Chains A and B, each alone.
Chain A
């Protein structure tokens, strides 16, 4: 996988009917489905995390996250696709690695980074004062759960 990722770093039409034409662009069930660097490097980090190479994992997640967020200038390196996980479930996996590592003052620049960007999206939580109905997406309730373990 480590090789593959460097692999996908790297990159003609005849006026003729070639076979490529007639083949279907593949499905997700196919063994020919191969995402972009970003979609994979997430795979490496996931697969690195479920074994218990938290250290390796950490770095890998950071590299994922470096790509995605610094990327105004280069080519669009993209998020992990939506049968794959949402952009904030992925800052959470980044932090759970950074805890297994014991880099807890990194695991808090994470949970600061997240809720900095997403202020607006959050509930203003005045039901707290007015003492089920108002709406809170799991990943905000988590973000405090791992802000804490830190």
Chain B
């Protein structure tokens, strides 16, 4: 309706949503929105551009859902893939190994635990080949960047790549 009216941009409408309503619920909506087949995907093409415009909400999107939902978001709208890989690339690099407990952990409370990130990567991998090679290469290039070790203790990305076989 607002698309054909052309009065205010949909961005303003989506921003007022974000401000006003329960956010948690809201986002699952959008997520489902993106996979609904066309009915008259101008809507879907508006939501990708709103999200990419605002990185801060899209940080809580990738944070707030399950893995499968975001895996399908990616295989359908590949304009999201390399920003979300960017997010993990940014959260993994905020980990450290501790030798007492056989685990990476976060400094801060709000930092993805190991298991969460393992899930999400396992998902990107359990996917179509169009994404799988992208994320595999995006990790191997991240591994070489932090020393190509081939034992854990050292490179978070070693860890992931061992864990995924």
Contacts and interface: CB of A to CB of B under 8 A. Distances in A.
Contacts of B152: 128, 131
Nearest to A130: B102
A129 B162 contact: yes
A127 interface: yes
A129 B163 contact: yes
A132 B152 CA distance: 17
Interface string B79-122: 00000000000000000000000110000000000000000000
Which range contains the number of A residues in contact with the other chain? under 10
Contacts, number: 10
Interface residues of B, number: 5
Contacts of A127: 102
Contacts of B103: 131
The B contact surface, by secondary structure, is mixed
Which interface residue of A128, A131, A132 has the most chain B CB atoms within 10 A? A131
Contacts of A132: 102
Interface in A102-150: 127-129, 131-132
Nearest to B152: A128
A132 B99 CA distance: 11
A146 B162 CA distance: 26
B165 to A, nearest CB: 8
A129 B118 CA distance: 12
A148 B102 CA distance: 22
A144 B152 CA distance: 15
B95 to A, nearest CB: 13
Contacts of B102: 127, 131-132
A33 to B, nearest CB: 44
A129 B102 CA distance: 10
A132 B162 CA distance: 21
Interface string B139-165: 000000000000010000000001100
Given A128-B162, A131-B102, A131-B163, 6 more contacts: A127-B102, A128-B152, A129-B162, A129-B163, A131-B103, A132-B102
10 contacts: A127-B102, A128-B152, A128-B162, A129-B162, A129-B163, A131-B102, A131-B103, A131-B152, A131-B163, A132-B102
Interface of B: 102-103, 152, 162-163
